[PDB]
Amino acid sequence: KMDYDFKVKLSSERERVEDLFEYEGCKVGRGTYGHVYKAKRKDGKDDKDYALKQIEGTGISMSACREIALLRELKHPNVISLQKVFLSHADRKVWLLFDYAEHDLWHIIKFHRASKAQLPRGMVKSLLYQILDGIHYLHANWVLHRDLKPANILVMGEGPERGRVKIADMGFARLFNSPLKPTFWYRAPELLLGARHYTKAIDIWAIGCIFAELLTSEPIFHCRQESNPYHHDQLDRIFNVMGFPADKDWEDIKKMPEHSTLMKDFRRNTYTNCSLIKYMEKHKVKPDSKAFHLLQKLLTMDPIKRITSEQAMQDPYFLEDPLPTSDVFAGCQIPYPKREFLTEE
Amino acid sequence: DDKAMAGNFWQSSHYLQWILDKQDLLKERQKDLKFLSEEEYWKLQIFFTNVIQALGEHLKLRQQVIATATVYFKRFYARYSLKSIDPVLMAPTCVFLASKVEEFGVVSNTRLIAAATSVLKTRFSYAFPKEFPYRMNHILECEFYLLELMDCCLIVYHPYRPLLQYVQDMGQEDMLLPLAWRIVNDTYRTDLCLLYPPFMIALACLHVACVVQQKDARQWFAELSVDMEKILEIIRVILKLYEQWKNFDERKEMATILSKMPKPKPPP
Ligand SMILES: CNC(=O)c1cc2c(Oc3ccc(I)cc3)cncc2s1
C-alpha cells in the first residue's frame, strides 16, 4: 500500500538498466554471485566500457545488502568502485554497475603458464604493491575480503586507468563472520584446521599465495579439487612446500579445533627436507632476493607471525629497482587477449 | 560490534549526504504540517521511534541495529511525506533491512511478520484497532522503495561508540555510562541524528549525564577541541525533549494523531 501519485512519480523517474545500457549477449562472468556483463551506455555517448552485475536470486539478500552497504562507502583506486545501483521492481533483481576491467590475474597467469610451450620488469612487484595497497585500505576500515584469489584481482585495460589493479568480489556476507557457515589453494592453514572466524591474517596468506603464483606462474599450493573445514590433501601440499611447523613456529596451533586430527594424520618427519626456500629454488627464484624474503613473511604458518599489509608495503623490496608503477604494464603493449563472451545456455 | 568503516565518518555517506540543514528539513516538513501541528508531528515521530524499539527488542536485535533502523525511518520521512508509504509498513521494513546489514544472524520472513503482528497488538493496541494488515510481499516491496530512496546509504554511525570511548577516557564507566547510554537512546526521539555528527551527540548526552549525577567534568570538557556552542544546542534539544515527554501522553493521544495523518491515495 503506497500513495498512487508517489508510486507513478517514482516509476516515471526510475532509471532502468535495460533502458540505459546495452549488454544483450555480452556476458563475461557467471557464478554463485550471479551474472556479469560488459555494458555500454545506450545514450550518453560514453564510449566507456562498464561491468553490469546482476546479483544471484531476488529481493535483497544479506549478501546483496552488505555488498551495497560497504561498496556505497569504500573509495580507493585499487578497490573496484560501485558506480550505480539499479533495483528492478518487476523481477525483484538487483543490478550493480562498475567500471569494466578487461583483465584479471587468473587470465594473466594462465596466459603465461600456457607460454611454457612478468615481461615488463616491475609488473609482478607493481601488481603486489597495488594488491597490498587495496587490502590495506579495506583492513584499515575493518573490512575483510575473505575470498582473495587471482580471478578477483582485476586489472584495468586501455583507458585512463591503464594497468591499475582493482580488488573485486569481496566476500561481503559470511554468517557470524565464520568460514564454517555456507578449491582451497589460497586458504590459510588456520582455516584448514577449523578457525572459527575470518581475520586480516587470512587475507594476507592469500596474497602470499598470489605473489608466489605471480613469480612462478604456478599455484604454490596446487591440490586436487572438488561442510567440514579440514582438508587433508591441501594441508599435505602446504607441508610439502612449507615444511611441517615446529611447536616454536606456531605455539597456538594446539588451540585449533582440528589440531588432534592433524596429529592423527601427519608425522613431522614426513616433511623433513621440505621448505619454501627449496620450493622457490626449483622455480628459479633466488632465496636471497628481497622478493623471496617478503614472500616468506606473507606465507608464515602461524597467523600472528604473519606480516600485516602495511608492513608489507614498507618492505625494502619496493625500494629496490625496478620501482612499483601506477600502470603495472608500464607503458608496454598489453599482449593479453580481451574477454570472450559467454553464449552458453 | 560491527566495526566496518568505523574511522571513516568524515568521508562517509552519512556525513556527506545525510547531515541535513535544519531549514531544508523544516521546509520539506511543511507539506505534512498541513494536516498536523508541529507538536503532533513530533509526537508521531516519538511514537514510531518507540514502535521500532519494541520490534527490535522482540526480535532480540542489538541496540545498534535498532538505531540504524530508526535512522532509515527518519531519513525516509525527512524527504517524503507520511502519506507516501504507511509508516506502519515502513517501521518493520526499516528493522528488516537494518538487520540484513549485519551478518550475525538473519530475520526470517515469518519471524518479521509474526513480530510485527504480535508487537502491535500486545504493546500498541491503544493506537491500532486492527491487526497488522500487511503480508511479507508488502514488506519486500517497501524494502526496495526504502533502499532506492535512501540512495543505498546503509552504513549509519551512532553515538554509542564515541560515548564508550569518552567515558573510558573519563575513567568513569561505572558511574556515567548507564545514564548516558540511556540518554543517547532518548535522542532518537528527536531529529538530532539528522543534524549533528554522532560524537557531538555523545558529548551532549555525557554532559547531561554528568549534570544529573552532579559530577564535575568541566576540566575534561575543556581539554576537548570541539565547538561547545554546538554541544549546547544539542543539550537544549535534549532538555526540551524531556519537557515534551512529561506533557505528552502518547497512549491517550496517538489514535487521534494517527487519524489526522494524511493517508495514501489509492489508484483510480
Ligand atoms: C563477481 N564479479 C564481479 O564482481 C566483477 C566482474 C567484473 C569483470 O569481469 C570479469 C569476468 C571474469 C573474471 I575470471 C573476472 C572479471 C570486469 N570488470 C569488472 C568486474 S566486477
Q: Are A65 and B140 within 8 A, CB to CB?
A: no
Helix segments in chain A, DSSP class H: 4-13, 17-20, 62-71, 105-114, 123-140, 189-192, 200-216, 232-242, 259-265, 276-282, 290-298, 309-313
* Strand partners for B155: none
Among the candidates B122, B155, B188, a domain finishes at B155
The sign one gets for the Cα dihedral B107, B110, B115, B120 is positive
Same domain, B59 and B102: yes
Q: Kindly list the catalytic residues of A.
A: 147
Helix then strand then coil, in percent of chain A rounded to 5, is 40, 15, 50
Same domain, B150 and B235: no
Same domain, B59 and B104: yes
Domains in chain B: how many in total? 2
Q: Please answer whether residues A338 and A157 qualify as being in contact, where contact means their C-beta atoms are separated by less than 8 angstroms.
A: yes
Cα–Cα distance between B83 and B80 in angstroms, integer? 8
Residue with CA closest to ligand 1 atom 12? A29
Q: Nominal resolution in Å?
A: 2.2
- Method by which this entry was solved: X-ray
Contacts of B86 in chain A (CB under 8 A): 1
> What is the DSSP secondary structure assignment for residue B264, as one 8-state letter?
P
Instruction: Name the grid cell of A324.
Output: 612499483
Among the candidates B104, B128, B155, a domain finishes at B155
The amino acid that residue A49 corresponds to is D
Same domain, B36 and B125: yes
- How far is residue A67 from each of residues A172, A201, B9, measured CA to CA in Å? 5, 22, 18
- Interface probe with B: pick from A8, A15, A60, A178, most Cβ of B within 10 Å: A60
The DSSP bridge pattern shows strands A93-99 and A27-30 to be: unpaired
Domain that holds residue B137: 24-155
Exposed / middle / buried, residue A327 (Cβ in 10 Å: 0-12, 13-18, 19+):
middle
Cα–Cα distance between A291 and A317 in angstroms, integer? 6
Same domain, B232 and B133: no
Same domain, B132 and B219: no
Q: Does residue B74 sit in helix, strand or coil?
A: helix
Q: Which of A73, A92, A173 faces B103 most closely, judged by CB atoms?
A: A173
- How far is residue B20 from each of residues B74, B226, B228, measured CA to CA in Å? 12, 20, 20
Provide DSSP, A29-72: EESSSEEEEEEEESSS----EEEEEEESSSS--HHHHHHHHHHT
Q: Which of B154, B265, B266 faces A69 most closely, judged by CB atoms?
A: B154
Q: Please answer whether residues B119 and B51 qualify as being in contact, where contact means their C-beta atoms are separated by less than 8 angstroms.
A: yes
What are chain A's domains? 1-100 (3.30.200.20), 101-345 (1.10.510.10)
Contacts of B268 in chain A (CB under 8 A): 4
* CA-wise closest residue to A163 among A327, A331, A317: A327
Among the candidates B100, B131, B155, a domain finishes at B155
Same domain, B205 and B218: yes
Nearest atom in ligand 1 to A106's CA:
14
Same domain, B180 and B191: yes
Contacts of B81 in chain A (CB under 8 A): 3, 6
Helix (H) or strand (E) holding B170: helix B160-170
Same domain, B40 and B140: yes
Cα–Cα distance between A129 and A309 in angstroms, integer? 10
Q: Please answer whether residues A127 and A153 qualify as being in contact, where contact means their C-beta atoms are separated by less than 8 angstroms.
A: yes
Q: Which of B85, B103, B138 faces A62 most closely, judged by CB atoms?
A: B103
- List the single residue in B with minimal CA-CA distance to A62: B100
Same domain, B43 and B136: yes
Q: Please answer whether residues A85 and A67 qualify as being in contact, where contact means their C-beta atoms are separated by less than 8 angstroms.
A: no
Instruction: Name the grid cell of B154.
Output: 546503509
Instruction: Name the grid cell of B130.
Output: 486492527
Helix (H) or strand (E) holding A103: strand A103-104
Q: Are A1 and B103 within 8 A, CB to CB?
A: no
* A339 CB neighbour count, 10 Å cutoff: 19
- Interface probe with A: pick from B35, B72, B103, most Cβ of A within 10 Å: B103
We report the CATH number of the domain holding residue B190 as 1.10.472.10
Same domain, B183 and B212: yes
Close Cβ partners of B94 (under 8 Å, ≥ 6 residues apart): B52, B69, B70, B72, B73, B76, B146
Cα–Cα distance between A17 and A15 in angstroms, integer? 7
Protein residues whose CB sits closer than 6 Å to any atom of ligand 1? A 28-29, 33, 36, 51, 53, 80, 98, 100-101, 104, 106, 151, 154, 168-169
- Burial state string for A206-230 with b = 16 or more CB within 10 A and e = fewer than 16: bbbbbbbbbbbbebbbebeeeeebb
End-to-end Cα, chain A, rounded Å: 38
Residue with CA closest to ligand 1 atom 11? A29
Residue with cell string 537544549: B236
Same domain, B94 and B39: yes
A308 alpha carbon – ligand 1 mean position (Å)? 27
